[PDB]
Write a structure and sequence with these properties.
GO cellular component, one term (chains A, B): protein-containing complex
CATH architecture of the largest domain in chain A: 3-Layer(aba) Sandwich
Radius of gyration of chain A: 21 Å
Shape of chain A: globular
Number of domains of chain A: 2
Structural class of chain A: alpha/beta
Subunit structure (chains A, B): Homodimer. Interacts with an oxidized form of GAPDH. GAPDH stimulates the aminoacylation activity of isoform 2.
CATH topology of the largest domain in chain A: Rossmann fold
Number of helices of chain A: 20
CATH superfamily of the largest domain in chain A: HUPs
Subcellular location (chains A, B): Cytoplasm
Oligomer: homodimer
Bound molecules: tryptophan
Helix content of chain A: 40-55%
Catalytic activity (chains A, B): tRNA(Trp) + L-tryptophan + ATP = L-tryptophyl-tRNA(Trp) + AMP + diphosphate + H(+)
Protein name (chains A, B): Tryptophan--tRNA ligase, cytoplasmic
Largest interface: A-B, 41 and 41 residues
RNA sequence: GACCUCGUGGCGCAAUGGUAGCGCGUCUGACUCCAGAUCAGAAGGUUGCGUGUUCGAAUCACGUCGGGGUCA
RNA sequence: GACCUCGUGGCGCAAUGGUAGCGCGUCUGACUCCAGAUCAGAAGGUUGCGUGUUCGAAUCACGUCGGGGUCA
């Protein structure tokens, strides 16, 4: 019995979360082959590997989004981030990497939310500190290549006070969610502060277009698509239930699996936990070390046993990371084959990984460094977005 | 055992609420003669009759406000209103009448809050309807003579989205109040909506100057004074407890007694209840009728018994209303004397009342009619206030 | 997503198959200098909505809207 | 406003008057192609803050800050 909620991914199996069980448990829908070819037919583009490889595996109302898109009816993307301190590891990238692709292939506007107020309520920092962390994380997000002409990155602490329609939708949503409702959904108790208790309303507000008057004037019927880590589904199950009751459309969803922590898929990568993560501000040596010194293996103890029994892929953190970052499907297969056959040793694998991580993480740093203050401020300026 | 909270004033005694017991029960301070002369010494003005006659009877930190004022340290007024539909009776005026005086004699800026979002959560209407009711009630408030150069009337639904510091203080406050805290203070249950559960934070935010950046830039140490009906003390007991913990000063308070309902001081006047109120949009005949047909009497049944036993003032709604609106202290005394002695009959009294109500309510209508849309919009424009 | 529950004159209750009643309130006249109190009388709902079963339903069933609760 | 309660190495616990210990975690070497597992060793806190009582306090008292609870 795996446990998954907005603040905890914990399972006993080394193979990690049983996503098939998660889909059922949550009521979401499995993304099947049909849906994928259906996505390709609509974009005229080859499905991103996260879709091919089941990284993004679950959805909600996707066919309706496609049915609309295909019929010239526009949708907009909405995803977000809880601002961090120094953190921001590769795991935090998956959703954003996919969102950038979705933005390209479908050519649609996007709103990214920086829940600095959330952190302020959950962690121990000042609004300035929280807001700061956000404007900062903005760089890394921007560094993913989001089109500045179709992307609006905002901080709750800020935008809330400069929008004639966001707080208005928070009030609507709040009126339609009870303390009992969220007590169940998230697990809040009478002891939690009123601020945490009503925060869900805020993570839901972006699902409704008229929350962004300067981007959609006051249109209240524009489809919304939320790419995100399955652990965020709770907010939007709630959002989908509130939607009709206040006369707005339900946000569609594309769910992604968690990026396994270095010590094993028993949990997801996280800045809070020791050596479990590879940060976006990591030197090629640090990247190299962490992989050689912390990545859990599915390979046999000795070169001896490994040759006669090969390694196990269902648990090899290194092989898992490759499933996420090695583009070429042929190379990933060769490795899976050889590693399984014993033909390849764990270290030869750990090396293949580091060869793909270092350059990726390096490029990120390279693009991050090109993010000027003028730019950040632009992305973060309520303004009309293209399309 | 009288019962008083933000939504209910109920007592069994015809003499109404035992305010002395209320002060103790709430922990507030009785406004004694000293404090009154102290107010006169500071303003160089004769204390308003609400103070002379105990209408405004309780306070919190008033001496500190005076100590500061007298030493050239400025404070600002903050009071508010839950927007109504057609309502707005004389009872709703007391606080505002006194606030206008305080504004004059002390010469200080003022923020008036229109909790349209509160109504939206508690009643059954649309945000437009709620916002509308507010912009409307604004007229009647303005009609009280508040200096447009020192007064800012705002609606939560609106201002919240155009302030770089209000929502910021709501977030601070929310983090420092638990669901249990407000469950106790107000009586909210797990069934109430998250919006009602965290609303108190909003009625508290105006107590802090930096909530109004366009009026006080980002000063966080400006004394605040809240004139209000004692039934609102719960929000500010809570506000005073949260204040220091977030590094802001505690709001001072001036409490006023309730305006007794026509049928008797057992409850306060209210639009919800039948014939218990006299509306600001009432014809001289309606005013006249309500008083002759509904005002509870303390006079004897027949002219006979009344002459030998006189009337009772501790329960006569009409005499109570006069205590509120008859300026001249000598006339009020003559009436109290004669009515008690039997020298005057109840109807002669009911007549004296109507003679003071009709002209007052008439003037209000007269000034309300002069409130142009340009003006309302002005009062409601975040802008620098004089002093 | 599924499940439970409620939905009736302004308010609070009743009539679990064959004509929707009561209390509070609201209005009248009597009585009082008024008001209250006390007497006497009256007005007000096709039962959230749409069907269906039935000779006939508020009550039975399906659907739907809305409030509250609950589940992996 | 008053009252109760807690506050200790990153985490989670202990020592209710006379020298702050343990577990988890973190680092080393052994072992493994790595990692994990298993062995062997080590580093890390003057106990929210300020006093006071005492020969001596984390533990007692006063004050104060912060978390949680409670009252008319
Ligand atoms: N609460 C999320 C941040 C977030 C806000 N809105 C979102 C929409 C999609 C995904 C994530 C988000 C986090 O901690 O990462
Ligand atoms: N373009 C990369 C995404 C990416 C950006 N920055 C990164 C840093 C590390 C790994 C991947 C990335 C991809 O398709 O996967
Ligand atoms: N909630 C109060 C309105 C209000 C808001 N802020 C205030 C400050 C003082 C007095 C009243 C208020 C009411 O219903 O009337
Ligand atoms: N100026 C009046 C206040 C007031 C304004 N409008 C009113 C309407 C009815 C009664 C009083 C008023 C006073 O001093 O009491």
């Amino acid at each position: 019995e795996d446990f998954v909620d907005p603040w905890t991914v914990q399972t006993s199996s080394a193979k990690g979360i049983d996503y098939d069980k998660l889909i059922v448990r949550f009521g979401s829908s499995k993304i099947d082959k049909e849906l994928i070819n259906r996505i390709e037919r609509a974009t005229g583009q080859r499905p991103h590997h996260f879709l091919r490889r089941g990284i993004f595996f679950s959805h909600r109302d996707m066919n309706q989004v496609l049915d609309a898109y295909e019929n010239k009816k526009p949708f907009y993307l909405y995803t977000g981030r809880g601002p961090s301190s120094e953190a921001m590891h590769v795991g935090h990238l998956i959703p954003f990497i996919f969102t950038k692709w979705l933005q390209d292939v479908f050519n649609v506007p996007l709103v990214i939310q920086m829940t600095d107020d959330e952190k302020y309520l959950w962690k121990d920092l000042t609004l300035d500190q929280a807001y700061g962390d956000a404007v900062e994380n903005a760089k890394d997000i921007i560094a993913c290549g989001f089109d500045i002409n179709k992307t609006f990155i905002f901080s709750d602490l800020d935008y809330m006070g400069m929008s004639s329609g966001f707080y208005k939708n928070v009030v609507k949503i709040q009126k339609h969610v009870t303390f009992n409702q969220v007590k169940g959904i998230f697990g809040f108790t009478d002891s939690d502060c009123i601020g945490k208790i009503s925060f869900p309303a805020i993570q839901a507000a972006p699902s409704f277009s008229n929350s962004f008057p300067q981007i959609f004037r006051d249109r209240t019927d524009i489809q919304c698509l939320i790419p995100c880590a399955i652990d965020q589904d709770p907010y939007f199950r709630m959002t989908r239930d509130v939607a009709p009751r206040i006369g707005y459309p339900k946000p569609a969803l594309l769910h992604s699996t968690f990026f396994p922590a270095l010590q094993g898929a028993q949990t997801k990568m996280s800045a809070s936990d020791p050596n479990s993560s590879i940060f976006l501000t990591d030197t090629a040596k640090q990247i190299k070390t962490k992989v050689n010194k912390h990545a859990f293996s599915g390979g046999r103890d000795t070169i001896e046993e490994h040759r006669q029994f090969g390694g196990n892929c269902d648990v090899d953190v290194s092989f898992m990371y490759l499933t996420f970052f090695l583009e070429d499907d042929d190379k990933l297969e060769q490795i899976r084959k050889d590693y399984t056959s014993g033909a390849m040793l764990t270290g030869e694998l750990k090396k293949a990984l580091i060869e793909v991580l270092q350059p990726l993480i390096a490029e990120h740093q390279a693009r991050r460094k090109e993010v000027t203050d003028e730019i950040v401020k632009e992305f973060m300026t309520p303004r009309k977005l293209s399309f």
